[PDB]
Design a protein around this ligand. Structure first.
Ligand SMILES: CC1=C(/C=C/C(C)=C/C=C/C(C)=C/C=C/C=C(C)/C=C/C=C(C)/C=C/C2=C(C)C(=O)CCC2(C)C)C(C)(C)C[C@H](O)C1
Ligand SMILES: CC1=C(/C=C/C(C)=C/C=C/C(C)=C/C=C/C=C(C)/C=C/C=C(C)/C=C/C2=C(C)C(=O)CCC2(C)C)C(C)(C)C[C@H](O)C1
Ligand SMILES: OC[C@H]1O[C@@](CO)(O[C@H]2O[C@H](CO)[C@@H](O)[C@H](O)[C@H]2O)[C@@H](O)[C@@H]1O
Ligand SMILES: [Cl-]
Ligand SMILES: [Cl-]
Lengths: 314, 316
């Protein structure tokens, strides 16, 4: 009855924060130097009210060799290396960066920012003026909510380095998988209007980093759609995504609606807050989960949407 | 002194219509059925104000075989075929579509629209309910200028069919290159504040479809950046782009500023109107040309920008 494409259309009144890919698209039109300066100014302004959690040694170890190379470079080489990352050009550093998971890339840029503040790495020239288009993009970023602001920043960091297509040699570099939280120390979510055990186990397993028990809730046909990404189809691909990108998330669902669909299927929409380990309690992202469960109550499809405003929570 | 990347930053106060790639990015997030219905509704209201020029036989011949296949299909097959096009899925029709130039693809969709109106091809339902996000995107499109509206529509059409980005080599079907109009009968542009012959020959050669004389004005290192696209580097690549995508354009430049730069280079900004053969006089796109000429006055880089508003025409 249902396909992955048909399932994408569930709960069509859910207004996603499409200002995020819109702003990214606007950002992509700018020159490399403008792109680098805009992020510098957006990050600096963000830091005045939003505090970032410094990355641990386990994250820093992977980007250590690349950072030490940039640290031993000349100011023109350091600048060119950063321009190459933003331009997506073919360089050994860009190829090394390309192989990293989002968290390694984020941790790498956090360290470079600290180096730029300390004068260890060439800074954004004091006499730098953003283009008319870059200035308007910066105004847009300052006008959107913190959850949308950090998503814009993350997507820009991820989109850098040599194009992953046509690798030649690529060991996907990701952080080690932290053992799942002790069952005795686990918390259980409560969702007003939702008592479906698959949905509840989904939230609880992810909050405990229990990816092996989390993947069991998915059908063989199953798929997961992260915000503004295409659906990730199959248990193997979904599990890899969990292990590489979904460690230490805090899902705080509040309320939801469970509705019967055609041919024994179940449509469940949940809204709540999500905390990223990069900011913790400092940023509460407005999230909606759109579940399409098969007649066996297994996850055939789950869409995770970044919401336009807190109004979308109800 | 200058590189292609450095040249992209010339005249940084030029405010481009980035609402176009922003709206495209928003559009790309929608489902295939929503994407197709949104274009149907955007095109229908646009048709009431902005009249499209029907494609000639020379354009229609390339999409004829594909259109006849869809014409002989069932309503569910016809719908699936159009859904596949929007979804960028791997099917023979999507692979055929991917080989086509923007004009063939546009002409193909124009014919399908006529078939949908005539009931020959499965139409968009009664009062199709667009998603909350699709409705807001449609409002955005209705709120932007005609030049920005048609650019959004064209870019969506171009992005359909099989994705050939992961392919090192792909077949390319394009309209025949019509030989340029005779030199004596040609029109000559006049730009208030710009008398540089390379800039003037650029406008005049393109208005006459004289791509061979147009490419001669470009340096071997030369590049051309179309609106919201990456720069096309080299004479071979730039000439192919002219021959496949730049036939029958009408450039109406109005005014500009010529400024000397570092190491004998010249920075020239021109603003004016551009007419596409798809709409003719019905749509006047607000355009800026950002030229970076080498000390030999050859085009090292030229950026063509779709402007945010007609106010940007006076911004020099
Ligand atoms: C790039 C750059 C610079 C560096 C900037 C930096 C350090 C930026 C860092 C930004 C950060 C840390 C952003 C973090 C964002 C995290 C986000 C948006 C987390 C999102 C996760 C979510 C919504 C989880 C979603 C999920 C749930 C809830 C599920 O149910 C299943 C999985 C899934 C992942 C979809 C500087 C140095 C400043 C200037 C230079 O010129 C350029
Ligand atoms: C796709 C679709 C449908 C079809 C709709 C149709 C037929 C849409 C077609 C729209 C058209 C014809 C759009 C064309 C726009 C043309 C434009 C934007 C041309 C722009 C050209 C410019 C700006 C030229 C610039 C240049 C200049 C000035 C230079 O100096 C150098 C060359 C260069 C090209 C860069 C329907 C059937 C309605 C519904 C279905 O569900 C889906
Ligand atoms: O020429 C580009 C493009 O313009 C279209 C738009 O309909 O055709 C116009 O120009 C043709 C000459 O090139 C005329 O034969 C035609 O009548 C006119 O509409 C497309 O067909 C073509 O791809
Ligand atoms: Cl995260
Ligand atoms: Cl055109």
């Amino acid at each position: 009855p249902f396909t992955i494409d048909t399932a994408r259309s569930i709960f069509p009144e859910t207004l996603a924060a499409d200002v995020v890919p819109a702003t990214i698209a606007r950002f992509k039109q700018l020159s490399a130097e403008d792109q680098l300066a805009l992020i510098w100014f957006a990050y600096l302004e963000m830091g005045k009210t939003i505090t970032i959690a410094a990355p641990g040694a386990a994250n820093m170890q992977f980007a250590e060799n690349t950072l030490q190379e940039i640290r031993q470079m000349t100011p023109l080489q350091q600048t060119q290396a950063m321009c190459d990352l933003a331009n997506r050009t073919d360089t050994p550093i860009c190829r090394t960066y390309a192989s990293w998971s989002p968290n390694i890339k984020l941790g790498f840029w956090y360290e470079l920012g600290r180096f730029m503040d300390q004068g260890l790495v060439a800074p954004i020239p004091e006499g730098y003026k953003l283009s008319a288009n870059a200035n308007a993009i910066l105004v847009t970023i300052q006008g959107i909510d913190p959850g949308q602001q950090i998503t814009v920043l993350r997507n820009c960091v991820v989109d850098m380095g040599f194009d992953t297509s046509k690798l030649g040699s690529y060991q996907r570099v990701a952080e080690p998988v932290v053992p799942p939280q002790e069952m005795s120390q686990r918390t259980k979510v409560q969702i007003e209007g939702v008592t479906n055990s698959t949905v509840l186990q989904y939230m609880d397993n992810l909050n405990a980093n229990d990816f092996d028990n989390l993947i069991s809730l998915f059908a063989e046909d199953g798929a997961l759609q992260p915000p503004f990404q295409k659906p990730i189809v199959g248990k193997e691909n979904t599990l890899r995504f969990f292990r590489e990108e979904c460690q230490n998330l805090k899902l705080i669902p509040e309320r939801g609606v469970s509705e019967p669909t055609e041919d024994g299927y179940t449509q469940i929409k949940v809204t709540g807050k999500v905390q990223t380990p990069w900011f913790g309690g400092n940023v509460g992202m407005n999230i909606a989960w759109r579940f399409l469960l098969n007649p066996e109550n297994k996850v055939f499809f789950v869409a995770i949407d970044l919401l336009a405003s807190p109004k979308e929570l109800l």
